[PDB]
Amino acid sequence: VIVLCGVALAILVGTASSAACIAKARRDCLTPYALAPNATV
């Protein structure tokens, strides 16, 4: 059970933390364009 919860916790970090990092980069890379109404992305 300890190892299974370890796997579950690792998977939680893998998913939610990588998703958070990717969202951060996506969000902050979009915003310089999303703020510009005429920028050609």
Binding site: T31, A36, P37, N38, A39, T40
Partner: protein, 153 residues
């Protein structure tokens, strides 16, 4: 000039401004307080953590009343709510010491009745007060230029 600008209120006093461009409303993120107009307050803001800005698409009513943008930033004088501002070699310049805290979010306008930059603060170079501002690239990318030590208004 300010005809389409909107004030931001902190506990019943002005402490900054918000402005609508490209049908979305921009306001400095550091400016605590509530936007005056309820239609703007209903907007769910997106926070650009490194821009010190938050924004959201305005209700589709004033869709026709947004400020239009232009990339055009020829060096020279530009109009402002509190005067005329001079842009040179990547520096927007204001006569030293004029303007100050609570003036964040002020737009800067082109002589063709359009916005070119928004003010977030500034600092004096000695000859002029340089302003920390957002200014969009030749390719429209919203650049932020802010000479060192620029205080947020």
């Amino acid at each position: 000039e300010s005809d389409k600008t909107f004030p931001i209120m902190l506990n019943g006093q002005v402490n900054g401004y918000a402005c609508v461009v490209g049908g979305r409303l921009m306001k400095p993120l550091h400016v605590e307080g509530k936007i005056d107009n309820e239609q703007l307050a209903a907007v769910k803001l997106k926070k650009a953590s490194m821009y010190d800005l938050e924004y959201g698409d305005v209700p589709q009513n004033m869709k026709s009343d947004t400020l239009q943008y232009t990339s055009d930033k020829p060096p020279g004088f530009y109009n402002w709510h509190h005067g005329a501002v001079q842009y040179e070699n990547g520096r927007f310049t204001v006569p030293r010491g004029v303007g100050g805290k609570g003036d964040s979010g002020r737009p800067i306008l082109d002589n063709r009745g359009r916005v070119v930059a928004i003010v977030l603060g500034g600092a004096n170079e000695g000859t002029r007060t340089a302003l920390s501002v957002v200014t969009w690239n030749q390719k429209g990318v919203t650049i932020k230029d802010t000479p060192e030590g620029s205080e947020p208004w």
